[PDB]
Amino acid sequence: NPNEAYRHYMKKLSYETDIADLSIDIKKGYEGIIVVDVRDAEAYKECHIPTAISIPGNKINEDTTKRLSKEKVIITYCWGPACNGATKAAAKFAQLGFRVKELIGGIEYWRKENGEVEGTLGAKADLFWNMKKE
Amino acid sequence: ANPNEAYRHYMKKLSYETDIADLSIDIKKGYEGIIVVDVRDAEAYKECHIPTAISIPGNKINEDTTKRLSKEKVIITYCWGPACNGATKAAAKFAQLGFRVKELIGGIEYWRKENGEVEGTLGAKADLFWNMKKE
Amino acid sequence: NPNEAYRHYMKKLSYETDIADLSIDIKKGYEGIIVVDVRDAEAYKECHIPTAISIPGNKINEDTTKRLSKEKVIITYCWGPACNGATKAAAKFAQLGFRVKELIGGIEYWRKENGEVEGTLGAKADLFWNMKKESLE
Ligand SMILES: [Cl-]
Ligand SMILES: [Cl-]
């Protein structure tokens, strides 16, 4: 029924955010969020989203987030739609008592949507995770 | 989890959405039990949209703009693609209006990547993705 | 609240797996999973994921799954993000009593993430589903 549907979509929206919404908070300098790149350290060093900090997914714990305020909202992101990293991170952040949303689209679509990137390689970095690279 | 719980989950998920495949079918056979609604900006629509689809910007979904729509048909909302949440937000507003709705995963982005035809001013010449930098 | 949030995220993962996780399973030779390609038979024969068996979604039932172990886990995959195949498939498998998870990204992102492909056309096969090829097949 309509009511059940409404609750469903709203709830789904409460656990996520898209490239468009993020691009606005960054552009307006909203400080109510902390953008966290949960991919590999070297991946972040080569290319990452503006204002984002690095915290590889397997490194999320009390020590690596001691400086993060529980008053803000954590936005996690991985490579893209084909990655589950952002989701695994969200669970860990949540377990640590944070309010968290996962970015849908990842850095892949942030770039496809013509977003700016920072890093050692920038727009020259690989668009996708390379399963064979390692 | 166990099969019983798994079955419920997957079925439920399927009840709130639909893919490019199922859409193309109802469009090919001219099914009229649906109303394809483009939620993106008015300009994007006019430039390139899915066949049989109407234009209703997400931020404009309300009683006034949905007065000619029949609660008898099923609403199918769609935005740019996997990176957009428009279709989802649109579904909530539509369900809030007492409608029966489903969001289209893939957006018009995959409708094209899947050799789908489009109508509009620029047609297949329109940009594939949303441009953050465009004013 | 954090508590509910944790339950939500954990449950979402319990019904899926990604390219990365599957690649590690294929490489480590894990036998606790059964990769099932749910697309059209022809598509599979042309290009599919290593160690995966062909079982078209519309052809899933007790006859085609009789020789599959219930002790393992079924991983379904369709073309990609814009497909519901794997999800419809998961449901049927769950109805048959199997433990199952769907692969997000499908074969599309498997190949994009530089994955190996086996089949007739291999890496030369089409990357996306062709809406027109249907009438022609
Ligand atoms: Cl108005
Ligand atoms: Cl692409």
Sorted by sequence, the CB contacts under 8 Å of residue B72 that are 6+ apart come out as none
Do C40 and C53 meet the contact criterion of CB atoms below 8 Å apart? no
Contacts of B129 (CB under 8 A, 6+ apart): A109, A112, A113, A114, B80, B81, B83, B109
Query: Hey, is the C-beta of B14 within 8 angstroms of any chain A C-beta?
Result: no
- Is residue A129 assigned to a domain? no
* Helix or strand run (H / E) with residue A35: strand A33-37
The alpha carbon of residue C112 and the mean position of all alpha carbons in its chain are separated, in whole angstroms, by 16
Residue C84's identity, in one-letter code, is: N
3-state secondary structure chain B: CCHHHHHHHHHHHHHCEECHHHHHHHHHCCCCCEEEEECCCHHHHHHCECCCCEECCHHHCCCCCCCCCCCCCEEEEECCCCCCCHHHHHHHHHHHCCCEEEEECCHHHHHHHCCCCCECCCHHHCCCCCCCCCC
- Provide the 3-class DSSP secondary structure of residue C104: strand
**For this experimental structure, what is the resolution in angstroms?**
2.5
Q: CA-based diameter of chain C, in Å?
A: 52
Is the CB of residue B123 less than 8 Å away from at least one CB of chain A? no
- Sign of the C-alpha dihedral computed for residues A95, A98, A99 and A104 taken in this order: negative
Q: How far apart are CA A111 and CA A96, in angstroms?
A: 30
| 3-class secondary structure, C37 | strand
Helix, strand, coil percent values for chain A (each to nearest 5): 40, 15, 45
Q: Between A5, A104, A112, which is nearest B101 by CB?
A: A5
CA–CA gap between residue C106 and residue C87 (Å, rounded): 11
If phi > 0 it is left, if psi is from -120 to 50 it is alpha, else beta; for residue C41 that is: alpha
Q: Is B24 exposed, middle or buried (0-12, 13-18, 19+ CB in 10 A)?
A: buried
- Verify whether the Cβ–Cβ distance C2 to A82 is below 8 Å: no
- Under 8 Å CB pairs connecting chains A and C tally to 71
Report CA-CA distances (Å) from B39 to A4, B3, B70. 22, 36, 18
> Does B130 fall in a domain?
no
* Tally of domains in chain C: 1
What's chain C's Rg over C-alpha atoms? 15
State the DSSP H helix or E strand holding residue C127, giving kind and residue range, or none if neither.
none
CA distances from A87 to A11, A49, A70, A81, B13 (A): 15, 18, 19, 11, 18
In angstroms, the CA B51 to CA A87 distance is 35
DSSP label of C3: H
Q: Is residue B46 in some structural domain?
A: yes
- Please give the Cα distance from A65 to B61 (Å, whole number): 40
State the CATH number of the domain containing residue A83. Answer: 3.40.250.10
Q: Is residue C63 part of a domain?
A: yes
Which structural domain range is residue C67 located in? 1-119
Residue B64 CA to ligand 1 centre (angstroms) = 9
The string over C64-95, giving b where at least 16 C-beta atoms fall within 10 Å of a residue's C-beta and e elsewhere, is ebeebeeeebbbbbbbbbbbbbbbbbbbbbbb
Q: How far apart are the first and last CA of chain C?
A: 50
3-class secondary structure, A79:
coil
Q: Which two tokens stand for residue B12?
A: 């439920």
B131 domain-assigned: no
Are the C-beta atoms of residues B22 and B78 closer than 8 Å to each other? no
Q: Are A62 and A92 contacting, i.e. CB atoms less than 8 angstroms apart?
A: no
CB of A81 closer than 8 Å to CB of C105: yes
Tell me if A132 is assigned to some domain: no
Distance CA C42, CA A79 (A): 31
| Residue whose C-alpha is closest to residue B61's, from B86, B36, B94 | B94
- Domain annotation covers residue C130: no
Please give the Cα distance from A74 to A98 (Å, whole number): 7
Ligand nearest to the CA of C127: 2
Look at B85 and A13 and tell me if their CB atoms are within 8 Å.
yes
> Residue A125: how many CA atoms within 13 Å on its side-chain side?
23
Q: Taking each helix axis from N to C terminus, what angle separates C85-95 and B3-15, rounded to the nearest 10 degrees?
A: 150
Residue B61 CA, ligand 1 centroid: distance in Å: 10
Q: Is residue C124 part of a domain?
A: no
SS3 call for A12: helix
Helix axes B86-96, A2-14, angle to 10 degrees: 150
